Design goal:
Chains B, C, E: It is found in: Cytoplasm; Endosome; Mitochondrion. The complex is a heterohexamer, with three copies of chain A (about 25 residues) and three copies of chain B (about 190 residues). With about 25 residues, chain A is mostly loops. Chain A contains no helices and no strands. Chain B is an alpha+beta fold and about 190 residues long. Chain B has a single domain, classed as Sandwich (Apoptosis, Tumor Necrosis Factor Receptor Associated Protein 2, Chain A), CATH 2.60.210. In chain B, strands 1-8-6-7 form a four-stranded antiparallel sheet, with no helix packed on it. Classes of the chains: A little secondary structure (about 25), B alpha+beta (about 190).
Chain lengths: ~25, ~190, ~190, ~25, ~190, ~25
């Protein structure tokens, strides 16, 4: 169990990290 | 000739439309200061899901926000942002959800960056209340809870949340409407 | 000829009166969101008793309500309804009083029917505070506290309350004015 | 001592019950 | 001839300016009911110090007030009054500050005269929070806290407070702005 | 340490008392 991802406003893929896995 | 008569007329028409704008802005600007919440909780209401739905899967509309609810008369000013279809890690996949800090007028005295719980959660107006939800902690490192620059920062939130079908095929949507609930803290937050 | 000149004029006049209505509605619609109460208590203020009086014993006016006060930012929306002259069991006899539930926007998530105390009571701005009052319990059986249909249900209340003469000949009315106080619960009501 | 009567909006006399006694 | 055409025009122009006043008043009359505080605390915000400054040392402007903040939905209605340059015992000397009671609509039922703490204090948006402040007690004898007559009584307060230079040459003013905080009681004040 | 002075609105010097000493 882990939270705190980020604003996905189309564009920047992240400083080389961004994502999120769940919905399970 | 009487070219003045229209000159005035014309003068009357825009000044006229002006008010039909002011008197208008004072319309939407009547819900905020009517759906306002100062205790820390808040209920973002959303009617017209199907409509809201499409416009999103379409492109016209995809980034709704909410009544700026604060944590006490002169405190933080936070807000939510729904993405019906979903973005980042779930654009197509399913509904995404986010918390967010705007810029306030008293926002200056406040301690930065942010640091308060946020159980933003999708309700359930079905008959059993098994409504999905979740909270986290503001991480100073990653820029998104630090004293505001513009008027609202990088809407941070927990992308994957209520998944399309589970939401669309369930007991969460009613009369093409659903309610969202973000839960900020306050206790571990020295009241004024 | 210049028949256009009036055509515009006429166009300007109603659009004009329109605002004199909007800008107007935003007037009364400024007290509600100004005399608003979200904690459970509330003070329904009434000036012009004598006037209010007559109009009631007359027929023109006889059924006043009040500032929709809620039990917390996104909760129930209840209200009061005075009958100066009185109705049901006391039309002529004496002043009657009632509680009442409207329809809310968050009203959906709320648990039904109703079930909370209500010490609706006539104050006393005299010099001793011996102001009559009373409360009861919402009875599920009798239809009046069950999830709203229209916009406000069968205003339930305790008819016989402050009796004409006792009210008219006392220390309750001041400067042709009197204050009413309904007391709903909240505790035994899971806050958001 | 007993409360909880009902809206007296002119018309319906009640499902065969309505009233209220007090003012005493 | 067509002298009517202007007759209407002229009729349209003032009724027009009327709204540009109403719609206008509803502007300032939108902050009060937006910067409103009902718990007892409150933050009087002040931008444009330098400007505010001069106008005061000048004469045009010298007597600012604040958002009428109350001690609970239907309670007392108090307020503050700053004197940038200063008056009474410090006109030139330094900044003065005062508390004050207006006249309310529910103000009638309230117990008089006044009698509640008031830690009105100048904040400090510097980096250490060493913001000057102070409170006192309402003295019944001296007329200034007794049930209101006009709309606001003899603004009582503690003249000498934040001293010019100390305020002007410090860490209290930011972006030509400063925040004030009056602290009224409430506990020793029977809630509704 | 003592508070509670009064409104200095230009004019009346007080019923023979008004003042305030501090700023120290």
């Amino acid at each position: 169990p882990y939270p705190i991802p980020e604003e996905g406003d189309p564009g920047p893929p992240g400083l080389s990290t961004p994502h999120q896995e769940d919905g399970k | 000739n009487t070219g003045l008569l229209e000159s005035q007329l014309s003068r009357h028409d825009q000044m006229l439309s002006v008010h039909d704008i002011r008197l208008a802005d004072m319309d939407l600007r009547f819900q905020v200061l009517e759906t306002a919440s100062y205790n820390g909780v808040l209920i973002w209401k959303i009617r017209d899901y199907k409509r809201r739905k499409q416009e999103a899967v379409m492109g016209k509309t995809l980034s709704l926000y909410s009544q700026p609810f604060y944590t006490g008369y002169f405190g933080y000013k936070m807000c939510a942002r729904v993405y019906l279809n979903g973005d980042g890690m779930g654009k197509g996949t399913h509904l995404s959800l986010f918390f967010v800090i705007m810029r306030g007028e008293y926002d200056a005295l406040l301690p930065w960056p942010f640091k308060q719980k946020v159980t933003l959660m999708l309700m359930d107006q079905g008959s059993s209340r098994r409504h999905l939800g979740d909270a986290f902690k503001p991480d100073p490192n990653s820029s998104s809870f630090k004293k505001p620059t513009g008027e609202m920062n990088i809407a941070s939130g927990c992308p994957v949340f209520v998944a399309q079908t589970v939401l669309e095929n369930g007991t969460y949507i009613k009369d093409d409407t659903i309610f969202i609930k973000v839960i900020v803290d306050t206790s571990d937050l020295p009241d004024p």
